[PDB]
Amino acid sequence: DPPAPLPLVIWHGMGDSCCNPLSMGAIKKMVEKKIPGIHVLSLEIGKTLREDVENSFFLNVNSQVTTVCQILAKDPKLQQGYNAMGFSQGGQFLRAVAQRCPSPPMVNLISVGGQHQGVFGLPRCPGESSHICDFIRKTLNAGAYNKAIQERLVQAEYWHDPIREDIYRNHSIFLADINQERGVNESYKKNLMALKKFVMVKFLNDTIVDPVDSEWFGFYRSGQAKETIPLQESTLYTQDRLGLKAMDKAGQLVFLALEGDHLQLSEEWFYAHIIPFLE
Ligand SMILES: *[C@H]1O[C@H](CO)[C@@H](O[C@@H]2O[C@H](CO)[C@@H](O)[C@H](O)[C@H]2NC(C)=O)[C@H](O)[C@H]1NC(C)=O
Ligand SMILES: *[C@@H]1O[C@H](CO)[C@@H](O)[C@H](O)[C@H]1NC(C)=O
Numbered sequence: 548d549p550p551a552p553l554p555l556v557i558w559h560g561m562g563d564s565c566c567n568p569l570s571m572g573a574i575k576k577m578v579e580k581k582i583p584g585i586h587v588l589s590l591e592i593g594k595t596l597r598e599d600v601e602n603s604f605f606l607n608v609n610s611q612v613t614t615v616c617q618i619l620a621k622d623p624k625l626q627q628g629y630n631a632m633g634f635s636q637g638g639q640f641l642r643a644v645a646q647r648c649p650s651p652p653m654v655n656l657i658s659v660g661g662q663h664q665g666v667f668g669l670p671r672c673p674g675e676s677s678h679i680c681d682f683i684r685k686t687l688n689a690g691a692y693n694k695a696i697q698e699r700l701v702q703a704e705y706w707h708d709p710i711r712e713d714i715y716r717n718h719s720i721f722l723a724d725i726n727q728e729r730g731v732n733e734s735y736k737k738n739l740m741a742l743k744k745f746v747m748v749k750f751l752n753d754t755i756v757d758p759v760d761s762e763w764f765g766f767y768r769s770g771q772a773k774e775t776i777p778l779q780e781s782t783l784y785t786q787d788r789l790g791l792k793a794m795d796k797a798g799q800l801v802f803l804a805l806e807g808d809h810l811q812l813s814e815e816w817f818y819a820h821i822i823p824f825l826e
């Protein structure tokens with residue numbers, strides 16, 4: 548019966564699509580396998596595969612989210628609850644859906660390499676021992692926060708500058724809003740705490756996401772870009788603007804990790820640690 552197999556919603560990452568046999572399509576079948584009868588809906592933003600991939604780079608996130616909530620509302624099989632699983636940026640994107648549209652109701656939220664506190668660095672460009680790599684990130688701030696760029700560039704919408712955090716707070720139209728950086732939005736807090744399980748998967752040897760701690764809702768300590776602090780020690784947790792401390796107390800937060808690079812996981816691992824949250 549319907550209650551036994553809770554429907555699963557999937558949101559792919561940057562540069563990928565809803566229905567590619569080697570990436571999300573393989574996920575869809577690896578789930579329909581271990582769970583007979585499950586209804587899987589892999590989100591597609593736009594009318595074609597081509598628009599879906601380019602949309603992952605060039606369409607205002609807030610606009611994608613409203614589009615998604617519109618789709619989840621017209622699907623009858625979801626009205627009684629649904630699990631969600633986001634890949635890479637798909638992770639923070641699904642958390643926004645949870646915070647902004649309580650109906651239909653999301654149950655378990657699985658984040659696979661998501662960047663809940665954004666990013667501040669370029670792929671394979673460590674700033675510790677490289678001057679050129681470091682200059683770039685600290686300089687694209689004028690660009691990343693430029694009004695016209697903010698609404699046309701997906702990456703810019705979750706770029707988080709720790710050195711000049713006030714500029715980040717006043718100009719980010721996506722990440723800053725869902726992270727309660729400009730005053731606490733009551734419904735966002737109540738809506739997230741309404742989830743049952745929020746599972747965050749972090750790839751220990753990630754070279755693409757800087758800082759990797761963002762995958763566990765952590766980030767660089769304010770004022771600089773070298774040392775990082777975990778979610779627990781951050782102001783977001785301390786003051787509970789999102790309800791994360793309460794949820795953690797209640798056992799609703801799960802922190803998982805594994806060796807490997809970005810989105811590099813085995814069937815072995817996927818069957819042994821993720822499926823349990825979907826069944
Ligand atoms: C690949 O990278 C991850 C993350 O750095 C490694 O996991 C641990 O990383 C910490 C931080 O450097 C080390 O202190 C530990 O020694 C690492 N774990 C282990 C195995 O002790 C992971 O080990 C690395 N895997 C590779 C490529 O060997
Ligand atoms: C808070 O979020 C809701 C949507 O969940 C939105 O309608 C509202 O305008 C936002 N601002 C506040 C704090 O009211």
Ligand SMILES: *[C@H]1O[C@H](CO)[C@@H](O)[C@H](O)[C@H]1NC(C)=O
Nearest residue numbers: 711712713714715716717718
């Ligand atoms: C952004 O807005 C805040 C609101 O208090 C203002 O005080 C501050 O000067 C602005 N910060 C920057 C650098 O844009």
